[PDB]
Amino acid sequence: XXXXXXXXXXXALT
Amino acid sequence: DILDLEELREYQRRKRTEYEGYLKRNRLDMGQWIRYAQFEIEQHDMRRARSIFERALLVDSSFIPLWIRYIDAELKVKCINHARNLMNRAISTLPRVDKLWYK
């Protein structure tokens, strides 16, 4: 609900 | 209960009117006098408290718990010289009561 994830995405060994 | 000074004034008016009405209708209830004076000590208004104790003494100067309450009330608020005047007066009016001398 903080919505600080604007203009970014989740980050391979995974 | 009380959030504002004006609300404190309303509360104090109501309680003072109550106590003064009862002491008007029956002045000889010394305990009622004592707890009215205690109410004014709770309001931190020592002038009113002193006045109530003085009026109570004028109703009956011979009643020893009233003297002890007044003296202790003065001492509790660090008013030592007021207490000294008061105790000197107390023994001066009632010299044969051991309790005042010991106090």
Binding site: X1, X3, X4, X5, X10, X11, A12, L13 | -
Partner: protein, 247 residues
């Protein structure tokens, strides 16, 4: 959009960590001395997540990610920038971060964290001293294990907590001597014989039991005479009693 994933994330955390005893704990730790997408799901949510009940589940996974996010929840030092513990975090999560630094072998950072983590915590005085003993056991620093336990055994103000450190030290020396006897199965082998003898004579703990047991009481109640007289009864009746009465 994040809140649809934790049901699957928690279930994955159940499967992958599940697929991944006092004496044996020391034995295995001594033996060691002879020498990822799931994290990113949790790491993405924890940028903006509300509570530590989520953060509990992250700690079940890995270690570089777990370090890297917790660094944002640990206060900096005023001039070193070191990651200090906080009372805003609850104790279990602090221990998880400690275990993260321990698993990554970031030795100086670990011990620097332990200095503070002892410092901020009374009551948890046992739990961290035993775990710091594990840090010394797992690594090659066998000397400092004995020195730690010795310099902490003479600091116990209660009998239960004494019993915890004492039985641990007992098991440690037994298993260490047992381990290094088997190693002989010539300078390194001379060293094995020497240190066999050393641990088998740090076994003096079996001799001095009642002296330590009453020294605990002399720490509780130093000026209670009957336990000074008991500490006279336990000397070996060889004009040693002069030393006790003098003290």
């Amino acid at each position: 959009r994040k809140v649809w994933d934790p049901v699957i994330k928690f279930v994955e955390e159940k499967v992958l960590p599940l697929t991944q005893t006092d004496e044996a704990e020391l034995i295995n730790v001594l033996l060691v001395k002879g020498f990822i997408w799931s994290s990113h799901i949790l790491e993405r949510y924890l940028k903006v997540a509300p509570q530590q009940k989520r953060n509990e589940s992250l700690a079940t996974l890995d270690n570089i990610t777990i370090k890297s996010v917790y660094e944002k929840y640990l206060p900096q030092d005023e001039n070193s920038g070191k990651y200090l513990p906080s009372s805003e975090l609850p104790f279990e999560l602090n221990f998880n971060y400690l275990a993260s630094l321990e698993k990554l072998g970031l030795d100086n950072q670990y011990e620097e964290f332990m200095r503070q983590m002892n410092g901020i915590y009374p009551d948890k005085w046992l739990f961290l001293i035993l775990s710091l003993a594990k840090y010394y056991i797992s690594r090659g620093r066998l000397d400092s294990c004995g020195d730690l336990l010795k310099k902490s055994l003479q600091q116990t103000l209660r009998y239960s907590d004494f019993d915890r450190i004492y039985n641990f030290y007992l098991l440690f020396e037994q298993e260490c001597s047992q381990f290094i006897l088997g190693k002989l199965k010539f300078n390194q082998k001379d060293w094995t014989e020497k240190l066999q003898a050393h641990m088998a004579t740090f076994e003096s703990l079996i001799n001095l039991y009642d002296i330590y047991l009453n020294d605990v009481a002399l720490r509780q109640d130093s000026n209670l005479v009957e336990t000074w007289m008991k500490r006279v009864s336990l000397q070996k009746s060889a004009a040693e009693k002069c030393n006790v009465y003098s003290e």
